[PDB]
Amino acid sequence: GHMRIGIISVGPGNIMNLYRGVKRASENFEDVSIELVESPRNDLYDLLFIPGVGHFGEGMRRLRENDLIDFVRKHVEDERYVVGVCLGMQLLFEESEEAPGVKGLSLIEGNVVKLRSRRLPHMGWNEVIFKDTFPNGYYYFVHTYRAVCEEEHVLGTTEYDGEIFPSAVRKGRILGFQFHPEKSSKIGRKLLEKVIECSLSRR
Q: Which of 58, 75, 86, 153 is catalytic?
A: 86
List domains and CATH numbers for the chain.
1-203 (3.40.50.880)
- Determine whether 75 is an active site residue: no
Contact 157, 129 (CB under 8 A): yes
Alpha-carbon distance 15 to 134, whole Å? 22
- Determine whether 109 is an active site residue: no
Q: Which of 55, 122, 143, 180 is catalytic?
A: 180
- Determine whether 86 is an active site residue: yes
Resolution in A: 2.8
Q: CA quadruple 14, 20, 21, 26: dihedral positive or negative?
A: positive
Contact 114, 129 (CB under 8 A): no
Query: Pairing between strand 163-171 and 137-140?
Result: unpaired
Strand intervals (E) in 9-124: 32-37, 47-50, 81-85, 95-96, 110-114
DSSP letters for 120-131: -SB-SEEEEEES
The experimental technique behind this entry is X-ray
Contact 80, 44 (CB under 8 A): yes
| Residue 90 DSSP SS3 | helix
Alpha-carbon distance 146 to 115, whole Å? 6
Closest residue by Cα to residue 165 from 180, 184, 178: 178
| Residue 23 DSSP SS3 | helix
